[PDB]
Amino acid sequence: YRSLANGFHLKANVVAGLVNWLAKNDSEFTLERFWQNISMTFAEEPSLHQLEVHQPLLIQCQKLSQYVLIAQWAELSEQEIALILLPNGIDNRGSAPSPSITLLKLLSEFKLCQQEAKVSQSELFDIMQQLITDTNEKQEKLRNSADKVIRSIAKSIGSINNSMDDIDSTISIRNGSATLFPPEHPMYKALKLEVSNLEKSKIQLEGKKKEEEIKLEQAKDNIQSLINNWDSEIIIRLADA
Amino acid sequence: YRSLANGFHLKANVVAGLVNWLAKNDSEFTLERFWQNISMTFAEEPSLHQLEVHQPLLIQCQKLSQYVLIAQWAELSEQEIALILLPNGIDNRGSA
């Protein structure tokens, strides 16, 4: 996708949208099949007659260039393409509608929607995405991505408590192994520094723990409050936009 | 402050004035709490739904952007902000 995007004067996510767009209309096209058709020709001796023989590349590259012309005319962003690559999208037909006049005026009315709103357009794509989606996969997806960060913060505290227990055990061992040692600066003046330097590591691990506990509390507060999706707030967001 | 200032097209002392400005109004905001809320998300696998869950960042960043709009409209310098961050300032009310 990056090399096809830089071959034209395009962006990587726009080409990654357009190839997946063309992955549905004209289902003979596949990006794997496109790479296999590239690797069939361009051998140890490439030439122009090898392209004249292998006409599916001459179909597929012009087929790509048509959707590139449509994306340059309608001036599509990457999230504009990603909104139409939703599995039902505009709900007139399924995902990735074919390039007819119907699509090519749907994009015109879509650009009129982007002109009328006088707000940030990513707000419009989020509102339009909740109008396309169902607010049942979205809520469970937020719960999954919420329990993921609960799991990660709990795993970080469980991994730091092991190192704190290790440092505490080694300090207890080095305190238990110390005796009177009537040579003080020859022999006793090596365990005191070796304990006092690890005391600072204990203070640093407690300083990390006293903020990761705040991370747990803020997570468990911001995750036990995802209840209020009631489907009437989206038209309120439209009246805001 | 330097990385937030270079994230926008701002100066470092202007952002250091505006965060201390917002440290007083809406006392739930703290720069330490802002860094902790950044470090809660953006884990080994960050995504956009993790921001959709953690709505205090979505409050605090828009709250910062409001004072950025006020500082760009009034065209505040760093010592203009530092004069209003005096502990009584204009003496109509307290600081900030």
Add this chain to the structure above:
Amino acid sequence: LCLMAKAVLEKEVDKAKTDGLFIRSGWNDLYQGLLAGEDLQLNLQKLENVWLMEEQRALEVERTVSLAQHYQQLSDHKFNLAEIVTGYMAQDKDQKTGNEQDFVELKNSTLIASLSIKGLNLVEDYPETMHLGDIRRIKQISVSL
């Protein structure tokens, strides 16, 4: 290469200091991967500083443990080595194993004179009550016959 350098410095320098070096990938797909070499340059400079600060002087020990300890070995299966290999010069494909750790056998005409490293007892040479040696690492093993 940077991951090689990290995994090689984690041999000498312990893993309590090389933690936050190569956690994140410097590549950014949303841009064209710009400033990805700066992340590698910083994370090699920080690695090099970890190496130059926290590299310590080795304390070398040359220890000669001959195989006159099979007579000493475990006191339940002990044997004389020269006598038993004289016994193994004829009557092929036998075995008098000491243990599964220390033994002298031959499966084929090749004979095996095995020796456990824990049975060497090299941590008794520089024991406790003098405080040194968190880790003991073998540097080089040479053989005389």
Add this chain to the structure above:
Amino acid sequence: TGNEQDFVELKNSTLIASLSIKGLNLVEDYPETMHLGDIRRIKQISVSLPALLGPYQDVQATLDYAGENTHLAKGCTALAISRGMNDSGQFQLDFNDGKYLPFEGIDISDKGTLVLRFPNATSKQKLLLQSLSDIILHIRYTIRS
């Protein structure tokens, strides 16, 4: 005990043959009335042992520095003995290396003691510590302006 500076003791089976560096009197070798040597710095300390070891018996021994020194780099206070001949605490001792040496950078007129601890003499160090004439302690230091 001779003194708290120079003594021979054993707290455990480990015996300690301590030795003060100020009691060595190395500033009398190149004295006044010839004008040189603002500072005298120890370059390298190697030990010889005129003991009998025979074919393959090893001596375990240490060396430590006792005084205060904020300039010994990392692990340069210690040195181990394994041969009995004129040896140091490095494999293939080389002065033309980028690293320092053990005991490198210690003044002559210091109040630190060279400790010279042997390990457990109740163990295999017996009959090795019996035949002990003395300890030679080849000292190589640097006089510089």
